[PDB]
Amino acid sequence: PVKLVRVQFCPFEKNVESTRTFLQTVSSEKVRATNLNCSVIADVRHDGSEPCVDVLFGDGYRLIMRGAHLTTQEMLSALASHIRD
Amino acid sequence: FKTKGVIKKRCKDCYKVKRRGRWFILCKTNPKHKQRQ
Amino acid sequence: GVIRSIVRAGQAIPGPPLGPILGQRGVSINQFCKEFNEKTKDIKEGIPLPTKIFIKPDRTFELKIGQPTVSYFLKAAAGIEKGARHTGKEVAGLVSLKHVYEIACVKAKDDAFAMQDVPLSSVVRSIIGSARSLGIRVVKDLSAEELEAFQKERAVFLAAQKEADLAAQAEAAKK
Amino acid sequence: LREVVKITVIEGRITETPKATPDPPNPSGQCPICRWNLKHKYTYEDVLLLSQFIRPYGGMLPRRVTGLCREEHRKIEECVKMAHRAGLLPNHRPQLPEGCLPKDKPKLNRYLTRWAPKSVKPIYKKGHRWNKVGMAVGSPLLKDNVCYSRRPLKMMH
Amino acid sequence: LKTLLPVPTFENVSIPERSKLKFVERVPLKDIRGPSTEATDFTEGNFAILALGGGYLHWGHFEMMRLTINRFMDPKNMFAIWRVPAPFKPITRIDHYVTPVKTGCLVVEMGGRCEFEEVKGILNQVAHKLPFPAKAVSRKTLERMHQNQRERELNNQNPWTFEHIATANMFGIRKFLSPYDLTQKGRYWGKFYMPKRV
Amino acid sequence: HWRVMHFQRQKLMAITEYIPPKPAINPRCLPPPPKPPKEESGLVRLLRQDIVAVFRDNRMIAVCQNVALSAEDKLLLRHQLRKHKIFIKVFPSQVLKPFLENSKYRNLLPLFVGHNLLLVSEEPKVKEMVRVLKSVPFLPLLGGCVDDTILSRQGLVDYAK
Amino acid sequence: VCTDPTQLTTHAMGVNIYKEGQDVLGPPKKLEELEPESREYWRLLRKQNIWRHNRLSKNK
Amino acid sequence: RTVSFQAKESMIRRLEVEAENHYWLSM
RNA sequence: UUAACCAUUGUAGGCCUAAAAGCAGCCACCAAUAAAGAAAGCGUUCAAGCUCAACAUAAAAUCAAAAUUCCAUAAUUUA
Ligand code: FES
Ligand SMILES: [Zn+2]
């Protein structure tokens, strides 16, 4: 029931790892199949930009999540409550 | 709820709690497994 | 949904073993066998071939087939219609290395389950393991006399097994 | 200490934390209780020590954050229950979700309370001199505390 | 990178042909009132049931052990033997015969290419149904059991002990003691064994 | 059935009860005993050589995160990469740390964190790596070194051209 | 199928099995045999560990 | 019947007196 | 030890079994895979199918002294 899920982060900088783990959970074959409406995409960059997660819904609601100080579980917790709408 | 002298988990989903002064095993999958001490 | 089967090309309609399973999903069994029969014509008839039919959400047939099975061929190579009923010490197959290597080379050509292992050592050992699974002992090389003596021993043993079958049949009759 | 702020866009901001008093009296102690020589010298009455391990709404903090050993984590947890039941933590009361008010039933004063008052049944057959049923006071977990009495503390009243 | 060790090798343990427990013929006060002097050694097997009290095992218990133990043991890998005699002591209202057992006796012995954990459950279950208190002990556990007992005596911090007071008649205590108490030293009372008593 | 003991006997039992010796300080509260010399199991030493071998053999080492994609789908990627004669390597990170701590490559330690996969080959078909990466969109690339030169994904893209 | 000792020992039965195509070493290494520091050694020991775990897990 | 604290001590005191009696009868 | 995750493939492997494919039956009990039992419990027209062990990343650490009507009052620390 999710239109699209976008995650961006800086690999070589030693910073938040929750976003990377959160991407792994998002990039799960079971999860991807269940929410078949979404095509998961992962991208990387070098700039001093804190990791940012962008979620797109068909209704137009956009949920942006930064792992800067959020743990991976809290990321998923926010999603599920938002997914329920 | 069967009240038994010794309580034993009966399946994977069975879990244990301490309610109102006694030990309970409660199973979400199978209500038959509910037990009290 | 992918459905496995080891059916032989010669007979394309097993029926109860697969038809109702396929029917439970809901398909035309005759259509399944006919395309299987098309593959039967391409292959020599009466030899098992692994199949990987996929029943799509559209309820269509997507047949995928592979080379002849190792287990049946090893039985065929050993000339065993029905394999040894114990296989712990009952050996009905005595295979030379040259036969083992040649057949293994043919084996490593399917992609479905990735028999693409570069070293033939893997494939040869894989078929040797199948031989161990079956009542077959993989000899390095055998003499024709040993096969004749072994065949004579097997015939005597099979005669004893037939006597054992007669004893079992007599016991079954009593039961 | 990080707090989550929502806007949807939500982000967590890390804030500076108050620092522990430096130079513990007993360095090389694993548990924070033993780096200050408090192994057997605290009870439910010591709100100042107990409060440090408590969430703002009265819950115990996880062991992996406090760093306490299991033996002392259980003692702190039990002491906190007794402290809550004694009304010594008026500012760590449970949060009221919505449309809920405190029971308004008058509060009975209690201390050294082992069990939750809700689930303890009355002793209707108290028993005679030698079969007397005992009313438990205190916690067994604190049986090793330093005692300044001639005889050990009377747990069963 | 989970670490691992070579699996314990029981290859040395041969399997007796008659692995299953044999049958027991139903027909062929101090007997249970003291420490045992028989069957206390493991011998061939590594796992056995330890009698922690004094009791009589009549034919009914023998069958329960027989049937339960026989069913689950694997002939290829497990075997068992009996460590106590068949019922021989008369009982009258000569109704039946009961085999006496003393605290410390090994009622039944098991062995084979199996770990204790595998045989823990059934032996404990079988023990629970025995008339006297019992337990399932491996070779290590019984050794540890004795070692702890000896360790307790050495490191005891109580100056006074039952043996010294009893033997020396301190306090005039032997007025209230039985002649057998001097030998037992307070460990054994009636048919009961007190492990915590040094 | 227990038979009541004479009170004098019961007094004797009470006074002769075992008393254990009590230490002044709990062993847990005390500093932990120093670890004895450890034993290397035949998993790190052999794998250590494998890490040594892959670095020695492969001039270019590029790192990408493990995607937890179905092994049935890993095979085709491995088969697709095998057709391009590019190999995949996966190793435990913790035993990879000591070499990466002291080796020619030491700034790649942040990359070698968590589930990961290694792009190893003998030829710098770096442009084709993107094509193999483009085959599966969701799989990302974290960085690494190509032709013994450490660079990030954005730099790799420019290097690929 | 072929049932001739001469053909069995001098011809390849399985090279070609299609209609158009006509008919044309020790025991598994023990932990002692396996080299202690070889991958072969540890991959069979791991299998032995699985065997032990399954054996223990049976009763629970 | 649990044995009282005072009862246990008074027996120990007497035992110590008799314990000394052993020493003085040994010479 | 018990906390996250995953489960591919030689092969539906010898066998009376209609069919039993790890898991009716009985048989031995090796292969590839960086990583996975010729299977440990589930499920079984039969199978597909639910997990445990495989791999990876993941934190901790032996037993405890019913029937007339309740029945002293009470009490945890001053040497
Ligand atoms: S008081 Fe030292 S371990 Fe907790
Ligand atoms: Zn249940």
Author numbering:
A (entry chain k): 12 to 96
B (entry chain 4): 65 to 101
C (entry chain J): 18 to 192
D (entry chain r): 35 to 41, 47 to 196
E (entry chain N): 30 to 57, 69 to 133, 147 to 251
F (entry chain I): 36 to 196
G (entry chain l): 58 to 81, 98 to 133
H (entry chain o): 25 to 51
Provide excerpts from the study.
S-adenosylmethionine (SAM) is the principal methyl donor in cells and is essential for mitochondrial gene expression, influencing RNA modifications, translation, and ribosome biogenesis. Structural analysis by cryo-electron microscopy demonstrated that SAM-dependent methylation is required for peptidyl transferase centre formation during mitoribosome assembly. Our cryo-EM analysis of the mtLSU from SAM-depleted mitochondria reveals ten distinct assembly intermediates demonstrating how methylation can orchestrate mitoribosome maturation. During translation, peptide bond formation occurs in the PTC, predominantly formed by 16S rRNA during the late stages of mtLSU assembly and involves the folding and methylation of the A and P loops.
States B-D exhibit a mature CP but still an immature PTC, which remains bound by NSUN4-MTERF4 heterodimer along with an array of state-specific factors, including GTPases, GTPBP7 (states B-D), GTPBP10 (states B1,2) and the methyl transferase MRM2 (state D). States B1-C1 were captured by incubating mitochondrial lysate with GMPPNP and subjecting the sample to chemical cross-linking prior to grid freezing. The states B-D, with an overall resolution ranging from 2.8 to 3.62 Å, allowed the identification of bound factors and conformational changes in rRNA and protein elements at the maturing PTC. As GTPBP10 dissociated from the maturing mtLSU, GTPBP7 remained bound in its pre-hydrolysis conformation (state C1), as previously reported. Later states, (B–D) retain NSUN4-MTERF4, GTPBP7/10 and MRM2 but in the absence of 16S rRNA methylations (U2482/G2482) fail to stabilise the PTC. Consequently, H89 and H92 are immature, and PTC loops become disordered, blocking GTPBP5 recruitment and monosome formation.
